[PDB]
Amino acid sequence: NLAPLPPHVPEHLVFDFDMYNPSNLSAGVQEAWAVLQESNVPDLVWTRCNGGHWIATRGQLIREAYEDYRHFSSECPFIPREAGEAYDFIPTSMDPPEQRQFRALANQVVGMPVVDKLENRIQELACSLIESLRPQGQCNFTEDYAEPFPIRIFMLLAGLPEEDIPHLKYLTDQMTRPDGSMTFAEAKEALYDYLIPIIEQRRQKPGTDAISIVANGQVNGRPITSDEAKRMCGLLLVGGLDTVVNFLSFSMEFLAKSPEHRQELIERPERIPAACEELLRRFSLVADGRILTSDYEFHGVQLKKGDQILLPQMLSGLDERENACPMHVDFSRQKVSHTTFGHGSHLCLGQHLARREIIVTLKEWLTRIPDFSIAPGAQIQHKSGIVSGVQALPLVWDPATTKAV
Ligand code: HEM
Ligand SMILES: CC1(C)[C@@H]2CC[C@@]1(C)C(=O)C2
Ligand SMILES: [K+]
Incomplete structure (x- = not known):
């Protein structure tokens, strides 16, 4: 379904890319x-x-x-x-x-x-x-580790029951990779329906969890309103349930398919932090954007007030102009340029938690399961959206090659 071309857009600039179902998705989302x-x-x-x-x-x-x-x-x-x-x-x-x-x-x-x-x-x-x-x-991997590891840590931090994960994860996913059953607005309202009573309860009797802290917090000297607290907590939930969760799968899929990279990190464990950064570049996964505040000529193109522009955070690091041999994973890459965690005033606030979760996963997984591969005959399928992901990641390994710590 192609929307009618606006009067100010020239045909030579038309490229019908579908961010929610890109044409070459079978080759990998990136x-x-x-x-x-x-x-x-x-x-x-x-x-x-x-x-x-x-x-x-x-x-x-x-x-x-x-x-x-x-x-x-x-x-x-x-x-x-x-x-x-x-x-x-x-x-x-x-x-x-x-x-x-x-x-x-x-x-x-x-x-x-x-x-x-x-x-x-x-x-x-x-x-x-x-x-x-x-x-x-x-x-x-997606359901056995990628999801439970970061999500349970977030639920703990937020003081929310793990039994609520299925519902919350479903809603979060409708805001980033909608299946079509809910509009963004409907998913947002459902998330707020969940949060409002909790925020009020914790403003009445403050706890030490993240929601209590936000709900009773101050912003530049004055009290945060219930509405503001709700709008912030909603964002934290999406960040905790649909970011690292997806990234871990892209990384593990790659390691399962590249024995040489696994061996490099096993033999030189000190390179894991650098590997984390290179993987964050190669398997960057976010793509949101902005709206034009006024008519504006940008790089020879006339943009009109109200026009939406997708600024894929994922693309910067894959740009050959920023990194040579962009699709190659080089843990020794001298200058790892990327905007995986954003750029500008909205730079990711959860990147410290994200890097910790990634580095801990790489270290602890390779320590116990150094040799593993994609399951027999499996064709790994990706999914695209505001945050891209891996549909399923079946992995196998010989227990005899593992180590119990
Ligand atoms: C692999 C993991 C992650 C990636 C790639 C990522 C990426 C990003 C990006 C690209 C933005 C900028 C959005 C924009 O400019 O519109 C952002 C903002 C943000 N992220 Fe993350 N994020 C990750 C994990 C997390 C986690 C785990 C949390 C906390 C639960 C988190 C909390 C936030 C918040 C609160 C903002 C908003 C900052 C603002 O608008 O000022 N992120 N993130
Ligand atoms: C683009 C993001 C990755 C960032 C944190 C969660 C997310 C989906 C937002 O809505 C802001
Ligand atoms: K808006």
Whole structure:
């Protein structure tokens, strides 16, 4: 379904890329998005898919747009427009100056000071989950580790029951990779339906969990409102349930398919942090955007106020202009350039927790299960959206080659 071409968009810039179901998805989602960087494609194109929107295809433009919030507003950050308009999470739906005050509060619940504190719980859960899987010689990685590890850590931090995960995970997924049964607005309202009573309960009787902290927090000297707290907690839930969860699967899929890279990290464990960064570049997975605040000429293209522009965070690091041999995974890559965690004033606030979860996973998995592979005859299928992922990741290994710590 292609939307009618707006009067100001020239046909030579039309490239009908569908961010929710890209044409070359079978080759891997990053590969599918990379088609936007083929020689015949302009730096900035217009797709008639998903209501019609621009797409910046090179790191230079992506970075410039994320820095220029005066022209590229985060008030409507998602495609399609209905989703971008319903999207009201804090701080993401706000532009500076208003946005700034809320970042400090979010940092208090998912920032570094919180990670170093959860250190032991994170370490222990990773080891427990992996040791239980180790003797089985197989696992469905997405449901057996990728989901439970980061999600249970988030539910613990947020003080929410693990039995609520199926419902919350479903809702979160409808906001990033909708199956069609719910509009973004309906999923958002359902998430708020869940959160409102909890936020009120915790404003009445404060706990030490993340929701209590946000709900009773202050923003630049004054009390946060119940509405603001809800809009912030909603965002934290999405971040905890649909980011690292997907990234871990892209990384494990790659390691399962590349014995040489596994051996490198097994023989030189000190390279894991660097490997984490290279994997974050190669398997970057987020793509949201902004809305034009006024008519603006950007890199020779006339943009109109109201136009939506997708600025794929995923593409910067895959841009050959930023990293040579972009599809290659080089743990010794000198300068790892990427915008995987964003760029500009909205730089990811959960990246410290994310890196910890990634590094702990790499270390603890390779320590116990150094040799593993994709299950016999399995064809790994990816899924695309605001956050891309892996549909299923069946892995196998010989228990005799494992180590119980
Ligand atoms: C692999 C893991 C992750 C990736 C790739 C990632 C990526 C991003 C990106 C690209 C943005 C910028 C969005 C924009 O500019 O519209 C962002 C913002 C944010 N992220 Fe993450 N993220 C990850 C994990 C997390 C986690 C685990 C949390 C906490 C639960 C988190 C919390 C946030 C928050 C609160 C913001 C909003 C910052 C603002 O709008 O000021 N993220 N993230
Ligand atoms: C684009 C993001 C990855 C970032 C954290 C969760 C997410 C889906 C948002 O809505 C802001
Ligand atoms: K909005």
